[PDB]
RNA sequence: GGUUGCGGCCAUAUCUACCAGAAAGCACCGUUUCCCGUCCGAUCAACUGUAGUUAAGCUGGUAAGAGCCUGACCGAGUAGUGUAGUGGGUGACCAUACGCGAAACUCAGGUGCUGCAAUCU
RNA sequence: GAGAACAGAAAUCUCCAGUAGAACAAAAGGGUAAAAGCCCCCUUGAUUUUGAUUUUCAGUGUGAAUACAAACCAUGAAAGU
RNA sequence: GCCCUGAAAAUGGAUGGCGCUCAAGCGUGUUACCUAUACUCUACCGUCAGGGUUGAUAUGAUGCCCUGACGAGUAGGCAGG
RNA sequence: AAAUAUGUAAGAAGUCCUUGUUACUUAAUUGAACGUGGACAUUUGAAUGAAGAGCUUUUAGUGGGCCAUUUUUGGUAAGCAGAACUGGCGAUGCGGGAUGAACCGAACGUAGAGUUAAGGUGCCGGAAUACACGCUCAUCAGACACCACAAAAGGUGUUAG
RNA sequence: GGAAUACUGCCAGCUGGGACUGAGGACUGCGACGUAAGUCAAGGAUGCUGGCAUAAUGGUUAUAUGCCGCCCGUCUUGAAA
RNA sequence: GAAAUUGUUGAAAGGGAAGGGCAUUUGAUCAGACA
């Protein structure tokens, strides 16, 4: 009892009913998977410059 | 039965370019990448460590990380009816800065120019690109150029 | 803007007819389709 | 025929009255559709729709969340408006004056406000006082605090909470949730 | 392919910095409208020169009218045509009153005698056979003999209503 | 302009055969006490710069040279190809319409450019 | 290729040419020349911690892999690896 | 090129049939003409959308009024009845 | 080394200036990242379109498929068997192809008037036994895509080369 | 030499014949014609005249005639089978 | 005291089924509006 093995027939018809939705994009993306050494420092860096700009409201 | 390993199907695509085998020239390494830079991806068969999978050959992503010997590149690959994000860890031998944007950069610095050269003169800005326009009228002359009359030509066999 | 403002015109079928026995070859081959240049007016006028 | 390019006869997808069947609500809506058709103030337009909202899109606002908004720079004399119930919050120890205009006020919420000599106002009373919503602060409550939205988007590496009934050790904490039992999520 | 007109068409390659004023070439083209004519022009040019329409321009299109349209003429005609198994050069002679009528019957004759459609033919030359005795195909010399006369036997007059009360006669 | 040290592009820098190279440099070149390496002080290590040389290296120039690089309506709008037709043909295949468009060929023209530092009739 | 007693088609010695025509466990394909091949020297990074990533994919698991972080080591004059 | 030979199967039979030969055949041209649930305009139904209108002293505010577009349907969903 | 397909880019999340933060990094207040302050508005940076765009939850049926043009594998081949892209049939009537799931035209609310498509107009049958130039006479002529087949090879039949 | 004509195109030039349609229901708009008063074909048909006033028109039904129309339900790529 | 199914009476149609769709003739039958 054999039957069909494979086809892509009709597949892009379906993909286009509701999209191929463009990737979508953000100001400020995630640092996910960025160098830990960098990130560590970047932290205290930010902490500092925040603290400063806070002192700017003395 | 079937075979679909990591570098399957990549016979001529990770191949080396006629008469361009051997050491990579050193400039490949003096290049410098920063986050946000747009790079093109193209595998160097001679450098087995840190190699883009074949799907990412010919593709252009954006740096998101900089490392001792590599750049992390984010590419949006589309699977199903949608895109997902992929981060790639690539050695500098498989990446180059993309000219895909030099035009733009060229065009902006130029556009800011003739905006000052205009504005601070008395306007007539006009700095959007326009498509190839159809041809205006013109008068073609004959002096030294009378039309030569051509006909079609008989069948023949040369052999 | 001038042109987008205009709704697509809705013509009838030509009145004289199409002038040809089969429409779906190029004008240059005795059909109706493609750039038929200034003969566009004769047609549209028979459809408007 | 027409090569359509968008689905035909599509409903807009937004409520248009409330689903609710309360006369009073249906009267408040009678009021604000008038004000929104005839005043061009944006405020009235926002409120008309919030009235249609269902119970979930109307999380409660707490008197302490209220107290905080007045804490905004320039805002202490505004009248907070809430198209929903307002609830009590024994966690704040010092509640301001002001004027809150809502749909419902719980017993204690109403007391807390009044005890500090403030006012609780129904929307129609708010309308007569401020037909363009002059000097009004609209507050909405936290929608995605609902317990339900915990379980939305459950999948591998999503971190989302099983739909689970009993819930202790030995309820879904084994193979698939830790490196030492098959794998983790 | 239709009722023909004959056109002078003139074209040239588009001008450039280094080569402004390119050479200019002309074809007499037999088509039914100027749109077919111009197209035909580019068809043969690319059979001859490095050009496409994309990189060249039409400079002028003009209809040429027959010089003496009520003078009978003996045409010599040269053609290239494609058969089902080969391609072929050929010479017919046509007797009419304009090149334009001549080309109409040629195309007919080719379709009728050789099943050649328009796509498959290339007119090479059409020229007036100035002095008889250079007329060569007999089905034409036939009509040059002096004081020529002939009957048209067996007259069929066309009836204008289904029944007739006589019985016809083919006298003439 | 020469040359050297470090280079970038990596044959217009390569290859084959000849000839020419001032001045400096580089080079070849002398030595075996010492560090050091060898079956062999050839390589590799050290010492001298003294005793010797343009012979080689190197640099350049010649050649209807080999290769390589560049150009061109040279070939060719050719091969191939996206789109069209109730186009032709029993078929195999093939014309036509609106577009895109090679490779070989052939001819001409070239034969390293250039960055940093020191040095030189 | 041309050379050397026994020594021959094939033993071991020398010189010239040599883009790889060899070799790199294994199928084949990529890759490689002061190396990725051949000889030698020193070694255990085939180690410790726990994440991210790529292929296969549901963007689950497994296999295999990549680039980092935190250790402890190896080798090298060193850059490094 | 057309035609002819090459050309053999089983109930009687199919250019759709009759029949057609300067065709009612083959190639090609030129006009006219016939007719789809398609196209143009109009009325009416329904669906979707955008406006307008609580002002009583009369009757539907889920109403009333203006306007524009659209309508195939198995499995299947939902809605008004 | 094509053609067709294919990645990215065409700005306010932009460009430029002045100079803070750090444990990273530099020989180095060097860099790197994140910033504070300042300068330039819609010809603000191609086209065409946009009955708007974005987002969330939940659930049905389905998980035998078949066909056409083109690409294409196995097989002598198949109304055979298996892939690629699109378009269809399945789920779909309507006009044409006599007939027919898939071809051609065209996609459906109830109707009037008009015009057409594909396909036709001797008669069946609405519509020229219309015009025009050739060709063909068959003692098994021929007659319209898909399509309901014919070949090598021959003819001093006839036509034009 | 100087005209005519064909062909293609234009006119917010004039004018005849024939078909379908007449949605809307005070007024409100954009205009046209006039010295003006007025008038009008300008945001959807009115005027004038006749016939019948009942099975006459219309509905229903039976039959006849033109064209059209296979047996539903099911499973199936595919059923009138 | 339904239907299948039957008898009689009346009316109608029928050249290898019947039944159905658009349309109209003919026969039978009938509502409404008019004043
Ligand atoms: Mg099975
Ligand atoms: Mg099967
Ligand atoms: Mg299956
Ligand atoms: Mg395989
Ligand atoms: Mg490895
Ligand atoms: Mg007309
Ligand atoms: Mg007509
Ligand atoms: Mg007419
Ligand atoms: Mg036809
Ligand atoms: Mg019209
Ligand atoms: Mg909680
Ligand atoms: Mg002439
Ligand atoms: Mg010297
Ligand atoms: Mg010694
Ligand atoms: Mg020595
Ligand atoms: Mg030494
Ligand atoms: Mg010398
Ligand atoms: Mg040297
Ligand atoms: Mg040479
Ligand atoms: Mg060809
Ligand atoms: Mg092609
Ligand atoms: Mg087609
Ligand atoms: Mg074909
Ligand atoms: Mg191998
Ligand atoms: Mg080395
Ligand atoms: Mg191991
Ligand atoms: Mg993984
Ligand atoms: Mg699993
Ligand atoms: Mg995984
Ligand atoms: Mg594996
Ligand atoms: Mg036959
Ligand atoms: Mg017939
Ligand atoms: Mg004919
Ligand atoms: Mg209709
Ligand atoms: Mg309509
Ligand atoms: Mg429907
Ligand atoms: Mg693209
Ligand atoms: Mg638009
Ligand atoms: Mg919109
Ligand atoms: Mg579902
Ligand atoms: Mg499901
Ligand atoms: Mg399922
Ligand atoms: Mg198809
Ligand atoms: Mg089915
Ligand atoms: Mg259909
Ligand atoms: Mg039919
Ligand atoms: Mg048929
Ligand atoms: Mg018949
Ligand atoms: Mg008829
Ligand atoms: Mg006629
Ligand atoms: Mg055919
Ligand atoms: Mg033959
Ligand atoms: Mg013959
Ligand atoms: Mg009316
Ligand atoms: Mg009315
Ligand atoms: Mg009555
Ligand atoms: Mg009467
Ligand atoms: Mg009866
Ligand atoms: Mg009946
Ligand atoms: Mg029938
Ligand atoms: Mg069944
Ligand atoms: Mg079956
Ligand atoms: Mg009883
Ligand atoms: Mg009837």
* DSSP classification of residue C1: -
Residue B49, token pair as written in the block: 């460590």
Asked if chain E contacts chain A via 3 or more Cβ pairs within 8 Å, the reply is: no
Binary contact (A15, B66; C-beta < 8 A)? no
Which nucleotide's C1' atom has the smallest distance to the CA of C28?
F97
**DSSP β-ladder status, E25-31 and E5-13:** antiparallel
Contact present, E87 and E81 (Cβ < 8 Å):
yes
Crossing angle of the two packed helices D63-70 and D107-115, in degrees rounded to 10: 40
Q: Is the CB of E124 under 7 A from strand F?
A: no
Residue D95, token pair as written in the block: 């509640």
Contacts of D92 (CB under 8 A, 6+ apart): D63, D64, D67
CA distance B93 to B49: 10
- Sheet with E73-82, side-by-side order of all strands: E87-96, E73-82, E121-128
Q: Residue B146: its chain E contacts at CB < 8 A?
A: 24
Using CA atoms, how far residue E120 sits from A42, B152, D18, D69, E82, in Å, is 77, 13, 75, 87, 5
Using CA atoms, how far residue D144 sits from D149, D151, D163, in Å, is 6, 11, 17
- H-helix or E-strand spanning residue E11: strand E5-13
The conformational region for residue C6 under phi > 0 = left, psi -120 to 50 = alpha, else beta, is: beta
The 3-class secondary structure across chain D, one letter per residue, is CCCCCCCCCCCCCCCCCCCCCCHHHHHHHHHHHHHHHHCCCHHHHHHHHHHHCCHHHCCCEEHHHHHHHHCCCCCCCCEEEEEEEEECCCCCCCCCCCEEEEEEECHHHHHHHHHCCCEEEEHHHHHHHCCCCCCEEECCCCHHHCHHHHHCCCCCCCCCCCCCCCCCCCCCCCCEECCCCCCEC
When scoring C19, C21, C26, C28 by the number of chain E Cβ atoms within 10 A, the one with the most, hence best to mutate, is: C28
Using CA atoms, how far residue D78 sits from D51, D66, D72, D100, in Å, is 21, 11, 10, 9
Residue D98, token pair as written in the block: 């002001």
Q: What string of DSSP letters covers A17-55?
A: HS--B-----SS---TT--HHHHHHHHHHHHHHHHHHHH
Contact present, E75 and E134 (Cβ < 8 Å):
no
Residue D63, token pair as written in the block: 């008197």
Which residue, among B71, B70, B36, has the nearest Cα to A28 in the 3D structure? B36
CA distance E5 to E37: 9
In angstroms, this model's resolution equals 3.0
- Return the number of other C-beta atoms located less than 10 Å from residue B96's C-beta: 14
Q: Which nucleotides of G are covered by protein (CB under 7 A)?
A: 29-34, 36, 50-56, 58-64, 66-70, 81
Q: Which residue has the tokens 């994009």?
A: A25
CA D54 to ligand 58 centroid distance, Å? 66
- Sheet with E56-63, side-by-side order of all strands: B148-149, E25-31, E5-13, E56-63
Which residue, among D15, D101, D13, has the nearest Cα to D52 in the 3D structure? D15
Which residue ranges does chain E devote to CATH 3.10.20.10? Answer: 3-69, 70-146
CA B122 to ligand 24 centroid distance, Å? 72
C30 touches chain E (CB under 8 A): yes
Domain E70-146: assigned CATH number: 3.10.20.10
Fold of E3-69: Ubiquitin-like (UB roll) (3.10.20)
Which residue, among E31, E32, E36, E27, has the nearest Cα to E59 in the 3D structure? E27
Q: Which residue has the tokens 């040369």?
A: B158
- Return the number of other C-beta atoms located less than 10 Å from residue B25's C-beta: 9
Interatomic distance C19 CA / J18 C1' (Å): 26
Which residue, among B137, C28, C34, B142, has the nearest Cα to E42 in the 3D structure? C28
CA distance D86 to D136: 16
Crossing angle of the two packed helices D42-52 and D23-38, in degrees rounded to 10: 150
* DSSP classification of residue E119: G
CA distance B150 to B138: 24
Which residue, among D75, D168, D36, D61, has the nearest Cα to D120 in the 3D structure? D61
Using CA atoms, how far residue D84 sits from D13, D117, E69, in Å, is 22, 22, 96
Binary contact (A15, B65; C-beta < 8 A)? no
B65 touches chain A (CB under 8 A): yes
Q: Residue A18: its chain B contacts at CB < 8 A?
A: 81
Binary contact (B65, A33; C-beta < 8 A)? yes
Q: What angle do CA D147, D148, D151 make, to 5 degrees?
A: 105
Q: What string of DSSP letters covers E21-56?
A: S---EEEEEEESSHHHHHHHHHHHHTTTSS--GGGE
- Return the number of other C-beta atoms located less than 10 Å from residue E41's C-beta: 24
Phi, psi for E120 (deg, rounded to 5): -100, 10
The experimental method, as deposited, was X-ray
Contact present, D96 and D116 (Cβ < 8 Å):
yes
Phi, psi for B80 (deg, rounded to 5): 70, -140
CA distance D40 to E142: 97
Q: Is the dihedral of CA D32, D33, D34, D39 positive or negative?
A: positive
Q: What string of DSSP letters covers B53-105?
A: -GGGTT-EEEEEEE-SSEEEEEEEEEETTEEEEEEEEEEGGGEEE-GGGHHHH
Which nucleotide's C1' atom has the smallest distance to the CA of B79?
G59
Decide: residue C39, CB within 10 A, 0-12 exposed, 13-18 middle, 19+ buried: middle
3 state DSSP class of E92: strand
Binary contact (C36, E39; C-beta < 8 A)? no
Strand partners, B90: B71
3 state DSSP class of B156: coil
CA distance D26 to B97: 64
Residue B69, token pair as written in the block: 């010997």
Binary contact (C30, E39; C-beta < 8 A)? no
3 state DSSP class of B40: strand
| H helical segments located in chain C | 2-5, 40-45
CA atoms within 13 Å, Cβ hemisphere of E35 = 15
Contacts of D31 (CB under 8 A, 6+ apart): D123, D124, D127
Binary contact (C28, E1; C-beta < 8 A)? no
CA distance B114 to B120: 10
**Hits for CB < 7 Å against strand H across C residues 8-47:** 10-13, 16-17, 19, 30
């Amino acid at each position: 009892a054999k039957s069909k093995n494979h086809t892509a027939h009709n597949q892009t018809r379906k993909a286009h009913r509701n999209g191929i939705k463009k990737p979508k994009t953000y100001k400020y993306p995630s640092l996910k998977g960025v160098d830990p050494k960098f990130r560590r420092n970047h932290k205290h860096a930010l902490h500092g410059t925040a603290k400063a700009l806070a002192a700017a409201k003395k | 039965g079937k075979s679909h390993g990591y570098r399957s199907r990549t016979r001529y695509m990770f191949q080396r370019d006629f008469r361009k085998h051997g050491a990579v020239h050193l400039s490949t390494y003096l290049k410098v990448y920063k986050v946000g830079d747009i790079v093109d991806i193209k595998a160097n068969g001679s450098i087995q460590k840190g190699m883009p999978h074949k799907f990412y050959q010919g593709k252009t992503g954006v740096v998101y990380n900089v490392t001792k010997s590599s750049v992390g590149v984010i590419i949006n690959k589309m699977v199903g009816n949608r895109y997902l994000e992929k981060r790639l860890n690539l050695r500098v031998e498989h990446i180059k800065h993309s000219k895909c944007r030099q035009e733009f950069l060229e065009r902006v610095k130029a556009n800011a120019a003739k905006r000052a050269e205009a504005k601070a003169q008395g306007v007539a800005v006009q700095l959007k690109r326009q498509p190839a326009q159809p041809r205006e009228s013109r008068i073609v002359s004959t002096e030294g150029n009378v039309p030569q009359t051509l006909a079609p030509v008989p069948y023949e066999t040369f052999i | 803007q001038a042109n987008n403002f205009l709704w697509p015109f809705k013509l009838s079928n030509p009145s004289g007819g199409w002038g040809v026995p089969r429409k779906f070859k190029h004008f240059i081959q005795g059909g109706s389709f493609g750039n038929r240049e200034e003969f566009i007016n004769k047609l549209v006028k028979s459809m408007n | 025929g027409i090569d359509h390019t968008s689905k035909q006869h599509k409903r807009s997808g937004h409520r248009t009255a409330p689903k609710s069947d309360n006369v009073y609500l249906k009267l408040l809506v009678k009021l604000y559709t008038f004000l929104a058709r005839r005043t061009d103030a944006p405020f009235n337009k926002v409120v008309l729709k919030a009235l249609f909202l269902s119970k979930i899109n109307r999380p409660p606002v707490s008197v302490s969340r209220i107290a905080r908004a007045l804490k905004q720079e320039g805002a202490a004399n505004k009248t907070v408006v809430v198209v929903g119930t307002v609830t009590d919050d024994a966690r704040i120890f010092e509640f301001p004056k002001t004027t809150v205009a809502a749909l419902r006020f719980t017993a204690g919420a109403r007391a807390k406000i009044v005890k500090a000599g403030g006012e609780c106002i129904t929307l129609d009373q708010l309308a007569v006082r401020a037909p363009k919503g002059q000097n009004t602060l609209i507050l909405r409550g936290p929608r995605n605090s609902r317990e339900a939205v915990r379980h939305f988007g459950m999948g591998p590496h999503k971190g989302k909470a099983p739909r689970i009934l009993s819930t202790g050790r030995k309820f879904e904490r084994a193979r698939g949730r830790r490196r030492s039992k098959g794998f983790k999520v | 392919m239709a009722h023909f007109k004959e056109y002078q068409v003139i074209g040239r390659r588009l001008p450039t910095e280094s080569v402004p004023e390119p050479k200019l070439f002309r074809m007499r083209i037999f088509a039914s409208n100027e749109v077919i004519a111009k197209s035909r022009y580019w068809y043969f040019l690319q059979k001859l020169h490095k050009v496409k329409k994309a990189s060249g321009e039409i400079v002028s299109i003009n209809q040429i009218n027959e010089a003496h349209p009520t003078k009978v003429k003996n045409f010599g005609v040269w053609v290239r045509y494609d058969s089902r198994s080969g391609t072929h050069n050929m010479y017919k002679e046509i007797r009419d009153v304009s090149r334009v009528a001549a080309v109409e019957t040629l195309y007919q004759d080719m379709a009728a005698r050789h099943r050649a459609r328009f796509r498959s033919i290339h007119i090479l030359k059409v020229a007036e056979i100035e002095k008889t005795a250079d007329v060569k195909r007999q089905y034409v010399k036939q009509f040059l003999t002096k004081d020529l006369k002939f009957p048209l036997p067996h007259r069929v007059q066309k009836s204008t209503k289904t029944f007739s009360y006589k019985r016809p006669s083919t006298f003439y």
